[PDB]
Amino acid sequence: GRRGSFVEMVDNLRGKSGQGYYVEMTVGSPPQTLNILVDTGSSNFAVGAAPHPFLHRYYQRQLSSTYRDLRKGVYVPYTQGKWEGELGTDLVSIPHGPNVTVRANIAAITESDKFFINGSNWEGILGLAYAEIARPDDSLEPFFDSLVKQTHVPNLFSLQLCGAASVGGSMIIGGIDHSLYTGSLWYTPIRREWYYEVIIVRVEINGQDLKMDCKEYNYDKSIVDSGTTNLRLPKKVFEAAVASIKAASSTEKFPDGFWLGEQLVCWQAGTTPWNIFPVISLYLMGEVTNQSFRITILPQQYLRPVEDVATSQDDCYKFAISQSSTGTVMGAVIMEGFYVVFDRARKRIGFAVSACHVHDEFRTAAVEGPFVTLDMEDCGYNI
Template sequence: MEGKLSILYICFVCLNIACCEEINLYGDAGQAYSVEAYLGHPHQKLKLLVDTGSTTLAIASYARQNSKEYFHPDNSSSIYDSGKSVQAEYSQGMWSGRLVSDFIQFPSLPTIPEVRSDIALITQSHKFFMNGSGWQGLLGLAYLPVGAWGDGVVVESWLDSVDRTLHKQISFYLKLCGPISISNSTHYGYFKMIDDHKPVKPIKTFRTPILRKRWYEVGVISIRVLSPVNTSPNDSQIVRDTVNVPDEDMCLKLNAEKSIVDSGTTNIRLPDNLYRQVVDELKNVYRNSQVFILDEFWYQGEAGCWPEPQVWTLPWLAIDLLSADADNQYFTLEIPPQNYMRVVGVYNSSDKTGTVSEYCYKLGLEAGGSETVLGYTAMEGLQVLFNRSAGWIGWQTSDCGTKARITGPYNVTKSLKDTCQLIRPVSEVAISIRAAQWALCAISLIAAAVLIYLLAPCIKTFFVRRLPSSQQISLSQAALVEQDNA
């Protein structure tokens, strides 16, 4: 079996090279997708997890229990150490370290030059490098407000460094293909950069607006289990409702905290009560199957193992997303069961009678408290474009992976932004300026109060004996600027 899989993989790689599209993303079960990078001078080769759910370029600088690969800062002649501490906390895990800058280059991204970028060198971590991860750091691709933090520190992202170097804004797309076959847990994909000003191929693109430029926050209108008549493998037999009337209560729950698109998260994460509702429906449908699955698989994240690879006959999932074209419009991502019934391991063990195989799976859905996260389980079999400057995410069908589909757009009678109480788009620049204005205002008020208190005796003297005009001074910085301009 292993020999056949190796031959299949080699043939697959050769076919893709012949088609002039290079595979540059890889991952093992539960480890998301990573890309190869060269850091420092001379180059040190490391693997970085491609993460749209964070911003900072963060690299391990010490050996972990399950990995001896890490960045050696003392071996780089081009590194600059700021001496400042930084840290970051995620929904699972955290790290702390120090802020440096160094050169980074991605050999599989030939259009992007080597750039000097801020790097958080991780010196301590907790539940961050999990499962013997095959990667040594994170390539954060989100916006600045969700970067690492420290006292008096602003950590620039790699994407912002690229924009600054090229003097233009660059977007990117992810084509996540999933495993090569149903009996393999290694997945692969493509990570490419896009010049926003160059024309692209005229492929049908469904766009959803980025509601807030922090994470890639979008409007998830509903998540549904499709009926069997809507999940026929033959496209000509697909029958769909003209429009699905959104469930207002579900929509409010899905977006109560935030709904984000996060390639660094494995599963589709739903608010607790909606998670139970969707999983109950899937479980009830599967009761008629001859294959028995324990509750631990459905509700507790336990793996289920079988002697043969499974061809799942479960229903498809529908994820309705707000359209960027109109407030009363949405489109639907249709996710096949091969996405959310994830193969997490293929195990072979030899005994006296021969070889015994086990194919293990986990459910690609999980409870997320009050937030919604569309992890890479919702992205496999699709091509996802992240247009950072224009503020939208484009979804396209893909020529690799599962046959996930996109349908729509569908119109409803009311504004979905109003119905679901979605936040209006606000640019990251406006957020930063507004925050700076309020901070400056507060500092000015405090400083003014302190100065008035300290200078009260001087003010009193001023009213008693006025100084000659030639000796007058101003205590206002704004006045000094005005005087210089005059």
């Protein structure tokens, strides 16, 4: 639509709190309109193409004169949910993105399990990571590769995800918009092009170092993934962080079910005691030798509001740091703090403080550096 300038893309994301950020897209001729989840954690573009009780609409191939069948089926399992369907290609646009149309690979989802989310209001997923993790294999070009190859759009995008039961945010395809952040952009390298893999080199909780061998933080990888809710941490790191949070906030008496995300903590509306809870800092590898920077999130990011489970008299929350056995996942808990620039052209990810992050009058999310890391240990997990 129209000029595709950055001002037209600001605020092009919507969602329900806790159910994913999506952008509007059109597929097929004539255009069929669907809300598509923005997922930096995977690389397949896939839309519902069959009735499903959670879907209010879906893509109908037979209606599109520009659809082509690739006669190959496909199966994707994620950490949460799975789906299968048929590969094909079709014309695709983004009404509040660039002003372009691209022929892209589409998976028509015909069966799924625990994938679609009731009331989330989206009907597909946009995998924005690289080919290497696309199913069935890396020869299925992801959408972002197609868009850059076929158009003039610069090889970057950036995301501003805004926390809380409606959320919003922006995907700027092709550049950086100055009104979505304040302060400076700090960049960490993309270690390998598959997931948007990065290296964490130090973790602090309330300024106190977790004091683990830095390889533990990236065992067996660390990714930035807009399709995952939580900050997911490898088991050993999960355990230490909970301990450290529990101590800093004297919540040793909270049930351990709260800490495994099996129960909500509820306070009188307007009284959440933000300040008993510690800020969390990740130091990320810098762009020069032995330099790093940190990102810092508040409890306002790692405690997430949950609605319609209890009286409006009360705010209730879920602990949204959880355990993983497949590496760190810097999910929405992390991304809601910052403006995040996915600078594929220069193999780097940028963080700046988000103009829209939830904070209080005492504390804000921060992005700070440079720090000289006296340690020349290689923090990446290798074997």
